[PDB]
Symmetry: D3
């Protein structure tokens, strides 16, 4: 049972989540930490989560912008969460391809 940290804005100054792709196990937690060039947010589309569930995509999205360095958000993927891929994106930096994918393994 582990916590994976994802940086919001690469140290370099690149507009990415790093790491962009993470694989986690039921019981684990992804923690987003505000890093370079804020603001960022974390959105999952209706069609971009297991079973295309809007209820679930909405529950997980953190649409509110995160401004100061240090600001964070955790999603902990309990065994209620269906296995599969959770593709998310940052709204202000969608143009730049600020994208991420979480895979919940088996």
């Amino acid at each position: 049972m582990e916590t994976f940290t994802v940086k919001m804005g690469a140290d370099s100054g690149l507009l990415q989540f790093e790491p962009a792709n993470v694989t986690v196990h039921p019981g684990d937690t992804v923690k987003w930490v505000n890093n370079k060039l804020p603001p960022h947010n974390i959105l999952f589309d209706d069609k971009q989560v297991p079973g295309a569930s809007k209820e679930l995509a909405d529950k997980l999205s953190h649409s509110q912008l995160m401004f100061s360095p240090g600001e964070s958000y955790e999603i902990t993927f309990s065994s209620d969460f269906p296995a599969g891929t959770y593709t998310y994106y940052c709204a202000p930096h969608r143009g730049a391809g600020m994208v991420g994918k979480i895979t919940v393994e088996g």
Copy 2:
């Protein structure tokens, strides 16, 4: 049991939903398709749905922007949904009066 299709942005290039007003029967589905001049989204204000239920207005809204041509979002109005009007709008094009109204009938 049928699916009504609403275009986002008229073929003409006008910034409206087309058709803006639709009447539907319980069990039917409304499907928005991204047509002209993206991006669009679909918002239902708290006071704009039967019983002014924010819980329900929120469930239905798709506040995330739809950018690419062909993207779609469906609401299907099962027998849980109260009879009456559901009035909505596109945030980016609020200024242009890009508004719509679904009427759940009988």
Copy 3:
């Protein structure tokens, strides 16, 4: 039992919630009325409401922009709402420190 009115944007023209800090009881209602310099919205971060409950913060947030004068949003704090502080802000005027705080008491 009562309804506390909160102006969005002060009479003077300052970008504030007025009154900013409010103490309510179980059974009471907070009503936000659109006043000066719209648009405004009312956002609760996940970490900013008792128990740090995102479910709660999301249910309470009115992220949709309120534009026309006199537009309103009420939250009525029943026995169900946990006692404690609910700290909110206005997205468009966050830079200006357009912030507020509701304290549910006993």
Copy 4:
């Protein structure tokens, strides 16, 4: 010696200049009038005027936004102006292809 009027935003509500293409004679004047869905402006890029003269493109642009209905801006093409095409666009509505072209003839 005449004045051609160009509407900013078609009566239909379409985001174009109307008429988008105009031919004028030396000594004539083009007058833009703010019509539907303000705000608009008029920009001529450096490379979009005869001889790709930035000095001239800049003179002609009215980058400031026109907000209220009835606002207008005139260019009058005296004999100083080189013969040829002057292609322009509206910044806010670039995405919608709100573009126009004046042709100074003979």
Copy 5:
């Protein structure tokens, strides 16, 4: 021969130039100093300066945004400047009525 300082954003936090109205004499200088709630800029419309001269309105406009406190801009009104009123506005805060007027006396 004097320099009139104008604050960009009132100490209170109000979105105004203070003083909003200034009367100056040929040879004097108005100095805008970035104060509260940046960014601000200073625009004069074509029609808003003596003789409706776009050449003059453009020369005087400081459209570029001013971000850090302390940033400034001077216009010194030599006797080439025609007497009369120079109405200007801040673009980001046009909605708020962030407006100013300089009168060049006799």
Copy 6:
């Protein structure tokens, strides 16, 4: 005599002018080419060019946004341009420190 190319947005995806700092001679040309993550523009503040000449800073600024890849703007620095440093920036990516500097030598 030569043309110095400056990429707008680095190959890597960083929001930079590349090369940022450039030394040119009288007779030489600086060409900005639109590269990654558009749009960009090229702004010279009034205080940021030799003699603090606004006339000069404005003549040189390309405030209009460049959108499509390969779009370009050249400034060719003749005997007429005062020796010294011309410091520029990109409005949209100012937050990211998308800055540059041209030094005209002897």
